[PDB]
DNA sequence: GATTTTATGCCTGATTCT
DNA sequence: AATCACCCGCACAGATTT
DNA sequence: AGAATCAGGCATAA
DNA sequence: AAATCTGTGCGGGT
């Protein structure tokens, strides 16, 4: 039945794996250590058992092997938790959604058949890398994207980069690296948020001063920030755009209905702006960070890279040139599942006790684990359905703002 | 080891895969209507160069290319999805011309990737038209080395014509097959007057058209569905009784069967029925069909009535079916129920945006050449300082300088260089310290190259009067993109001029038959 | 319904199939030894550019061009072929770089084609070289629509390095291999003296040279089948008997084997054997060979003599192999059997021919490059004329005319003609008429339109020089081609440096050793 | 397993083919009279029974299900072929050297075990077609190679191509027919010939005038004839060889023979156009084609193919040209296996009673038979290798060559 | 992604007959 | 060379229980 | 005691 | 004798 059985004949320090598909099912199998390590491939996707009767469930052949392999009983009046073999389970699927939904079905028939083994605690859940980086000598492995962008944007400031604004300023490691990092982190505030406004109009609000409400006035005041805004974001095109301005009153405030035009015959006819934009916290750290970044270059303006010196403007170019020579003499892989990993990497990043990384799944609570897993796996479809809707991207347009 | 509570981890992990299989795997595409799948299929097969009128290629050379390039997934699923797409009897437009076994509409088999061959079809080629001229956006791949479109740029209403389906996780999509000569007259209809109603738009679009030409039996439910796009209708097969005189002998012909209904199936189903004693007065059963016509011959006992027993059929066997039409599609990458005139407005939009795209890029490299052709013919104006400059130069480069330094005078080519709408023919990145100056023509550096370039063989007096023409031809189509560039009016007679083209290359008759209960 | 007797059709057919199979599947050729699907798979890998300084392309990709262009069979035939020549202890010098898993000694097996990528070695550049120059004939394909090498320009002795070995109908071939550096040696003594014997050619090949490096017992096989054609030797493993004192038990070190031996069949034969009683003296059997090299190690019991259960184990086990030397090879499309002097000297006639045949093809191409370059020269002598002959030009055609129809002053040149005189380098066709006659060149229509399609950018000094200076260079070239041609001491001169030359890169050093019996 | 059977239970109007292929059997399944035909695929090739024995043939499991469905007995004293199911039997074999192979083994299984099968006839052999030409509205299939230059001669002769001579006559079809066939069979003879004799001297040999042997003797003109056919070959040379020519005068009637140093470095010593190559027959009619081939064409020639006209000075320019125009709108399949046709094809190219092509198997003498059947298929290579050397190349020099 | 047993010639050792 | 046993939503016979 | 017979292994093909 | 319950198939994915 494709199970690998190991040496060790005491249930107390026993392991298995559930790995997904035949491939990576073959390289455990050559890797692992053979003393004390069980291998059980899974060829496809299982039964539900949340739908099925029981009738049907001893008749499928992966829960049986499955069932048969643990080597505890099922049903009432033959389930035995203390007759128990491998107190070690891990999961190990493959970092894609397919390997998420493999997850959660093996989650839902532990939960329901067999709660008592994860009450207990004998549940584990690996985690392979995604990333690999060599550098002729240093090499690694990286998990996640998060931690990736971390990586790239640590190996951009690793030394050097003394950045000479006019005549001899030197910001020497703390500065530049905490302003490039906030400088990050507004530009993915302002990335989750790209959906309800334009790039162009958010990426040049930072260049403008505050917006002054102090002395708005209905005339000649309103329509000057406005007409200074559009006249900046005409003359930097190239898409053969178009902004435009109206202004208007209603007795409490002065607001503005900007309207922009790019290969279309439509027109939005608005994209107001009122006392609650000013009013909003996002527009504050846009200002707060647009106070340091202004047109501190001067005439002469550069940045003393390794056996290199760029002298222009635009930083962001500079930026690009930076990262290009951070990635002149780099190697990335994108890993694209647990098939491509050979014997020895699976050995040294998953296996290995003593470098490898886990969870352990607990219960916290019983009645809404319950409630959560028969509204997800239930046979009804409008719950699931109305749970989807509620918790999607409108959940995900949260204005904190911060 | 660090804890986890089972919740947040069954939470992230289904809302993870439910989110990315509804705008990834199932659901259509309101402007193309097509998956992600048929894109990247139909985009592989455009960039091999396979074009509709040159050889075949086998099945596993466009299977392996996606699958390396674009489609990280298995292979069967991308061989289903190439076969389906070329057989008569799925889709009412096919996009693919095969060569092979590709089954038959008894539902039987299709053979492996490796006896099989295919290419693209005429009409495939009118999705992808004007591709490269900067229509619509490219993304990056799974792993960013290649680009693929972010929508086709197509000028056939396909989601309509070809129809759709698929499921997903909790919702799902089903769409029937169009005319398209009928779709194609709703639309001009819709053009001429916004403010249509489904009434009228019902004048121009009775129903649907299926490509096994079947009755439809009943027409309230297609007024359901086009108005809130939810409905039910009945398909039923053609059938009838004829009677040989003699000895009063009734036999049942059967010639078009239902959508998506297998042959063997009903034929294995009816027999086992009257073997069973279920259905009464049924003799024997035949099937006549050779390569000409759809026949099944059923005789009847000398003791029934032919009606009765055809009736009985209808009412337990698959000879009548139902359709549950529910159209839901993706507008701006969310899911969404539409009607009829949604659709439409959607389809008129994405080629209002398309033309005007095109019409953009067609300017900028007219004005680029008309830059050159005016060096060109500056520069033929002046030939023997032009050579003596050169041949006394020791290097091209010192030529070159010696070329840009000084001022060269228009001389007897005067008329026409100021003849044009002042900056009407003038790049928009030339700054104004070169071109025609105050009676002096000023050449930038690739300008003096070009002239480098130049060969012996234009100096005659042929090849000197065409680069004139040109020229000319060039003015005129500068102000023709500037006018359709201006008006909000010639753009949608240039749209009524191309869908006008598209009914009359592409059009054809009508098979399914509409009647009351 | 004609009716035919079983005899005649079994005659034909089975006729058929034999000599298909004789000369189109299991014998090599003489003058490079390969066979027609190893000169097809590496003429498909260098029409892909699949060199040896660039990235890998997937198996798959290479088996289906070779199979839809070339080959007309199956895959796994193609893949096992590929295969073969990728492993390290099959072929002597290894012409496929590949990168994957394709097997081990051990006994394993390679991945599929969809897990493994392949390219060309440094070698194989060697055996196609020259190949555009038409230094060998070509033939059409299975559907008349390509056109494949007859045989290629080989430049190392391919069929004795790597051997061969095949099945065919009547007939079979085994030839084994052997070294680079020792078979140079017999050429180069060959060339020296035509008449040599098998005695003096036996000084500079000892005999044969496998990849396992195994040891080779007795010497009468070797000349035997050197002096007829047909022999057999005998292929002895390294093995010793090690003891550290102390106890005074000793061990078996088993450090090589055999060719064409599998590992593991060898140790499970020995447990077999050894567990029967039928082998006295062994207490314990292990593997002890991972990564640094090969060890197996056998205890034997503490009353055990070494020597005496280690001659049992070649008279009973695998550690000892009998090879049938047996040499086939067709010569002018028709099987023969062959000697070692015979194989050298076709292998120094094709060489030969081959160099002619380049030589040739290089004297035309110069001689072409200088009739057109005479005539630029000379148009560059009078410019001014030229430009004021081709402006009073109606069109092209015209002005060709009147180039042609008239005489040219040499001008400064006509000093630089008095080396380029003597019909040396003169084109074979042209004719008497045209050329310099009486210190006035006439020019034909092609020099007419090369002149025509001139650039201005050659009218500057160095543009001007560089023709002098090119022309200077090809008159020596087209000298050197002449000398080669005219005499026959000077190729075999230059067929000696080349073949030094490969020696030189490709030498290595000797593995296998031979001892008496 | 592996056999689709028929509906038919009287054996007297049944059929049985045993195709090649699971591909080409799964297709033949489809397209068939289901009433009365039946299909038993064959994998790959099969084992030979003259070389096996008879433990080993009663081992196999091809030959057990082939036994097995033709319902006889086998052996001596069960063998009854009057119980015989499947009065017809057909091969259908692929058109290749591996389909021969098969159909070999086949017939020697069938002579071997049953000769009363044979001798009565119900064995056949069917015979698919190769190519299918389309050219808009005709449609055919053609077999072989030979029928494809028959149909592509054809319809380049297709209307018009009326050869104007000088001004305008007509040879209009028949005459230009005769004069393409001709051609042709003079053009296969000299392909046959290329090792004795160089392909251009022959080639040229047939515009120069016939040497007439007859008034030759010993005028000296035989000199002046070699030096202008010598100077004809080196005029167009075009490869770098270089030609000469000898004559001495040993008998009555002088004799003469050039001599060509080629590409490959090596002189042949001779070609002599001696007594026997004179008076051979294959000269005369090659001087009979030439009689007819002088200088036929005047100052002013064209060939007037269809509504198009081009001017030519030569027979082989008109006759590339008529070829390459009768090429246009034509469009050509080829069938590298039984298992590149849909069903509908081999139902009307093999299966059809009323359209299909067949042979029949029978004996004309006994002895013969077995004795070649033991000559070839037994176990003894050296008499086999004898039999093949007879018929080789060294007696495939027929010297008819008509 | 993993899925049978044959033809063809020369040589070995193991087993069966007289 | 086509086939393995499940996941997802909707509509519909034929079969058991109230 | 010694001939005669029977299997299995090597590389391109169904 | 009305009301639940159990199966089957359509088209892209392990
Ligand atoms: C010779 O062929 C030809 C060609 N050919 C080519 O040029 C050619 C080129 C490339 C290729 N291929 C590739 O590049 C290629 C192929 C495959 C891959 N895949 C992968 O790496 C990854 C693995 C990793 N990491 N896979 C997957 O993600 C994967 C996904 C799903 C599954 N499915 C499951 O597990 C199932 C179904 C379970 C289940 C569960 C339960 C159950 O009861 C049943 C089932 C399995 C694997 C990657 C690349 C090729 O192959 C197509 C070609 O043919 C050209 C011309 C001719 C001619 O004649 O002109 C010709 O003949
Ligand atoms: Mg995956
Ligand atoms: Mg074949």
């Known amino acids: ?402 | 080891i660090t804890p986890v509570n089972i919740e947040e981890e069954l939470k992230s992990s289904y809302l993870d895969y439910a989110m990315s299989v509804i705008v990834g795997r199932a659901l259509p595409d309101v402007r193309d209507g097509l998956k992600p799948v048929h894109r990247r299929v139909l985009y592989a097969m455009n960039v091999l160069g396979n074009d509709w009128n040159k050889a075949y290629k086998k099945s596993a050379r466009v299977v392996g290319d996606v699958i390396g390039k674009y489609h990280p997934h298995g292979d069967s699923a991308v061989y289903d999805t190439i076969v389906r797409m070329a057989q008569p009897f799925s889709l009412r437009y096919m996009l693919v011309d095969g060569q092979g076994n590709f089954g038959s509409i008894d539902g039987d088999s299709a053979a492996a990737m490796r006896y099989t061959e295919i290419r693209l079809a005429k009409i495939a080629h009118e999705l992808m038209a004007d591709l490269e001229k900067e229509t619509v956006d490219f993304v990056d791949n799974y792993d960013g080395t290649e680009k693929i479109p972010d929508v086709m740029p197509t000028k056939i209403p396909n989601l309509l014509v070809n129809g759709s389906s698929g499921i997903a996780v909790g919702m799902a999509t089903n769409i029937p097959p169009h005319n398209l000569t009928e779709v194609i007259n709703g639309c001009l209809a819709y053009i001429d007057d916004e403010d249509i109603s489904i009434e009228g738009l019902m004048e121009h679009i009775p129903g649907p058209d299926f490509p096994t030409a079947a009755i439809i039996n009943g027409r309230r439910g297609i007024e359901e569905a086009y108005r809130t796009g939810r409905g039910k209708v009945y398909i039923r097969a053609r059938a009838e009784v004829e009677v040989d005189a003699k000895t009063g002998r009734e036999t049942i012909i059967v010639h078009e069967i239902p959508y998506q209904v297998n042959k063997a199936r009903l034929i294995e189903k009816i027999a086992e029925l009257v073997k069973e004693k279920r259905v009464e007065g049924i003799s024997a059963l035949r099937d006549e069909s050779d390569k000409d016509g759809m026949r099944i011959v059923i005789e009847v006992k000398r003791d029934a009535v032919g009606e009765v027993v055809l009736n009985n059929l209808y009412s337990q066997t698959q000879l009548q079916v139902s359709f549950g039409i529910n159209m839901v599609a993706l507008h701006h990458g969310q899911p969404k129920i539409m009607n009829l005139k949604d659709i439409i407005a959607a389809f008129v939009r994405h080629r209002r945006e398309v033309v005007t795209r095109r019409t953009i890029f067609e300017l900028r490299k007219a004005r680029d050449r008309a830059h050159i052709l005016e060096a060109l013919a500056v520069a033929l104006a002046n030939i023997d300082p032009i050579i003596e400059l050169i041949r006394h130069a020791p290097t091209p480069a010192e030529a070159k300088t010696a070329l840009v330094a000084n001022p060269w005078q228009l001389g007897n080519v005067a008329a026409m260089l100021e003849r044009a709408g002042d900056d009407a023919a003038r790049p928009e990145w030339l700054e104004p310290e070169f071109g025609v100056r105050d009676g002096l023509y000023y050449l930038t550096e690739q300008q003096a190259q070009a002239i480098l370039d130049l060969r012996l063989q234009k100096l005659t007096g042929l090849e000197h009067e065409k680069l004139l023409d040109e020229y000319k031809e060039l003015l005129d189509q500068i102000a023709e993109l500037l006018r359709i560039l201006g008006s909000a009016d010639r753009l949608m007679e240039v749209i009524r001029e191309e869908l006008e083209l598209v009914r009359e290359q592409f059009g054809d008759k009508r098979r399914t038959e509409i009647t009351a209960n």
Chains 1, 4 share one sequence.
Not at chain 1, 91 to 108: C, E, K, P, Q
Not at chain 1, 151 to 171: C, E, R
């Open chain 1, 1 to 402: 039945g494709k199970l690998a059985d190991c040496q060790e004949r005491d249930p107390a320090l026993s392991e298995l794996y559930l790995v997904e598909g035949d491939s990576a099912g073959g390289s455990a199998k050559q890797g692992r250590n053979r003393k004390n390590q069980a291998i059980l491939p899974l060829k496809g996707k299982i039964l539900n058992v949340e739908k099925a009767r029981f009738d049907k469930m001893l008749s499928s052949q992966e829960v049986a092997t499955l069932i048969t392999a643990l080597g505890c009983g099922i049903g009432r009046d033959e389930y035995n938790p203390d007759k128990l073999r491998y107190h070690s389970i891990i999961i190990m699927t493959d970092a894609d959604v397919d390997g998420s939904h493999i997850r959660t079905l093996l989650l839902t028939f532990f939960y329901r058949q067999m709660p008592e083994i994860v009450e207990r605690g004998h549940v584990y859940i690996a985690q392979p890398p995604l990333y690999k980086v060599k550098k002729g000598k240093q090499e690694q492995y990286i998990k996640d994207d998060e931690a990736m962008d971390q990586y790239q944007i640590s190996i951009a400031l690793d030394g050097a980069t003394l950045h000479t604004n006019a005549s001899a300023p030197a910001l020497a490691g703390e500065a530049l690296e905490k302003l490039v990092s906030e400088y990050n982190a507004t530009q993915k505030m302002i990335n989750r948020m790209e959906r309800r406004y334009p790039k162009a109009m958010l990426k040049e609000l930072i260049y403008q001063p505050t917006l002054t409400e102090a002395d708005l006035s209905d005339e000649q005041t309103v329509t000057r920030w406005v007409n200074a805004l559009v006249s900046e974001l005409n003359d930097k095109e190239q898409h053969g755009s178009q902004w435009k301005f109206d202004v208007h009153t209603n007795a409490e405030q002065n607001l503005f209905e900007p309207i922009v035009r790019v290969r279309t015959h439509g027109v939005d006819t608005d994209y107001p702006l009122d006392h609650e934009f000013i009013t909003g916290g996002e527009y504050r750290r846009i200002c707060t960070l647009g106070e340091k970044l202004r047109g501190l270059l001067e005439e002469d303006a550069f940045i003393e890279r390794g056996e290199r010196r760029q002298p222009v403007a635009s930083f962001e170019q500079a930026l690009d040139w930076l990262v290009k020579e951070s990635r002149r003499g780099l190697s990335i892989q994108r890993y694209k599942g647990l098939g491509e990993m050979n014997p020895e990497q699976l050995w040294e990043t998953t296996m290995d006790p003593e470098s490898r990384r886990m969870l352990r799944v607990t219960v916290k609570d019983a009645i809404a684990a319950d409630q959560l897993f028969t509204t997800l796996m239930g046979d009804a479809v409008e719950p699931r359905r109305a749970f989807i809707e509620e918790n999607a991207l409108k959940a995900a347009n949260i204005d904190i703002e911060n």
